[model samples]
Target: FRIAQDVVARENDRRASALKEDYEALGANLARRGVDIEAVTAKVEKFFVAVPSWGVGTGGTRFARFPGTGEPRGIFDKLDDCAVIQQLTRATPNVSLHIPWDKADPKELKARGDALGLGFDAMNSNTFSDAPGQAHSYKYGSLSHTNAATRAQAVEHNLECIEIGKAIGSKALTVWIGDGSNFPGQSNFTRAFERYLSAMAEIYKGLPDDWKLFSEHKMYEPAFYSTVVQDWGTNYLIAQTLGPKAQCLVDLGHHAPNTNIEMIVARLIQFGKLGGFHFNDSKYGDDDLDAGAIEPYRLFLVFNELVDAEARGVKGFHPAHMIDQSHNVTDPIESLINSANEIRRAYAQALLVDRAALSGYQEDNDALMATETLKRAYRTDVEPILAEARRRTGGAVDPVATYRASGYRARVAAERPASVA
Candidate 1:
């Protein structure tokens, strides 16, 4: 739809033609190297990530949230916006819903999503904040609150989320709690955590026979000093205690700065406790900005581990992928388009990795060959495969440029920004 739009004027076509020639040459070179390009494109087509419904609109820090134009007025609108993202990128087919904020009538919302060709992924329970008019406030904490009443409230909310999610066809729920103290000695860490574990166990037991529960961990945030599930190890232990259906969720921005996330991925897979990820890119803190906006290589490396595990026949290892970031800058639609492309690029690059040869190097103790083998695949330019993937899937070779030309932002501005009251 966008190619025939205004971006392809005569001069633009000349530039595009030149770009296409460059890609054609690149593809031919890879082919000579015995790289099967179609195999790569096919793999790329199979990669899918869930778009966070909350991200369809701009998000503000606790300080303030500036409403952006065309912000989807309701959850249905958000699904429509996410559908538009899938239409151009062909990468995102699932949308992750945040509770209370995204809570709605299931039959209606599910039908709304079906019409737009979008399906629901994990339903995220928000214990971070207490919904307005709630009987209890999460002023201090939720799951980890020292008070048993607050803990019960938090657990009940999770149960409610699960009930709603089942109605909407979601089989999983992710829990990330802002349940730690800031001031030193302000609270007992062990006691608070014990309360959280007990609370989580109850919630976990409530999962229907088929539902999966995810424990999302973050190093620091609202609880500036600690988070209940602050790292992979803690998350892992929680999952184990909760039983088979419980798994750890790795949120990219939830780590301490300089954390080696790929190693975490490898470890989680090794343990069969890795449920999946909340993908985001952050420079210093929880920017929640966009995926791959800061460290493209890190994003690619994470996928490297993912594809490696998939090729290794790692069972019960299917982890969900969803974005969990929003900032006021840049139109949300353009940001979503940009994110879908970046994710596609990383997956394409990961597919280029020579797994069989690398595995041989590992077995032979050829450390350097193993390192270089991975590097060689990493260094190879897979843009041709990506472009070809987009072209084959009816997605734009350049979705962001295509999105901007559609005047989606302007059209959104004509529509009022709505807050579910």
Candidate 2:
């Protein structure tokens, strides 16, 4: 259900008084540190991330699927939910679609998005699941399949995604494969990756010059033995092999427990191989929990690297930010709204870091102080800045509060029947 503009206006009017006071006090504090609060607010206002289409509906694990009320029935419905997210947050202006799962007319999708003031982001190619009437099953593999026909089918699907993305105005394609071995001797690691690379090269050839091809690396899942594109190292090799426009997509939940994801992000940025991120949190393997729900510091650290990279004026520095999450308990819209805010919180905090002071501390071998420098920034609550930015953009100062008051979900729940069986 679409939220009326008057609803947002009334909410903002009610909260503006307190917001101004909080913002002025915060502004004064930041000014003492030689940082202009207005400048930072502008930066925060422009920070845009993409909401994955599949994430709008209730998601489930391999064990069970618990559907939510008013779940989106198709891509159009998903856009309606995504539009609500962008309407309140103003931080997510793009929607990323997964092929087959989100199949629809490109012209219609674009028209729907245009009406909502949202645009398309990267197109995600799915080879993890086989569809009905498929010629070759992905039981063995897709791009890395030993069977030539299976591999060809996988390549063709990716090419089709590119075509769809082009029609929808998406400039990039993100390819994540569940192709790997399940047993020790199930498949040849060397041969499998070689086949994968060959298939990717064909997909790369069909890419538009301005479009990027992101290869997402997951440690393990659906394959317990070994994964072909398992880690950043192998992902790097693939990007290097495919040349420019080919890069790695880092999914936060794709790594092992306690993995230094921020370090991985730094390395990727340092070498210009980082394409984008699939933001989500995980306690175990590929849990796909909401972003920053489990580890807030880790999220901040990753953004720290991003802000640092941008500061250095790194060339070809654009990194697509998209939420890849599963919301089973909470409402999907609420989960996405909070996740978007958390991501922005990370970026806002990262911008507050005293780079000059920290660098001097590092050079002086003051380890304790160097650590404190980062901690100081992380400790600060940048809620005022975020709220002000949203306020300026005609968004609710408190999105969740406004959402609850609007009762948009309940209204939609009545209009759109529940999908529970």
TM-scores for every predicted model: 0.92, 0.98
- RMSD versus native structure for model 1: 3.0
As a whole number from 0 to 100, the lDDT of residue 142 in candidate 1 is 92
Whole-model Cα lDDT of every candidate shown, in order: 0.81, 0.91
**How would you encode candidate 1's per-residue C-alpha lDDT over 1-421 as one tens digit per residue?**
3234344343234346655786778668667867777777788887888899988888787788887667786787788788878877788889989889887889998998888778899998987886778877887999888778888888999999999889888989989888887888887878877888999999998999989999988888888876777889888889989899999898888888799999999999998999987788999887887889999889989999998887777977988888777857777877877877778788787877778898899999999999887777768777666656666676666677666666766776667645641
lDDT of 2 by residue, 1-421 (tens): 2788888888998999999999999899989988888988999999988999988899887789888778888899899999999999999999999989899999999999999889999999999998999999998889999999999999999999999999999999999999998899999899999999999999999999899999999889988889999999999999999999999989998897789999999899888999987788878778888888999998999999999997887876789879999998889999999999999999999999999999999999999999899998899889999999998997889998889889988887887987553
Worst 10 residues of 2 by lDDT: 412-421
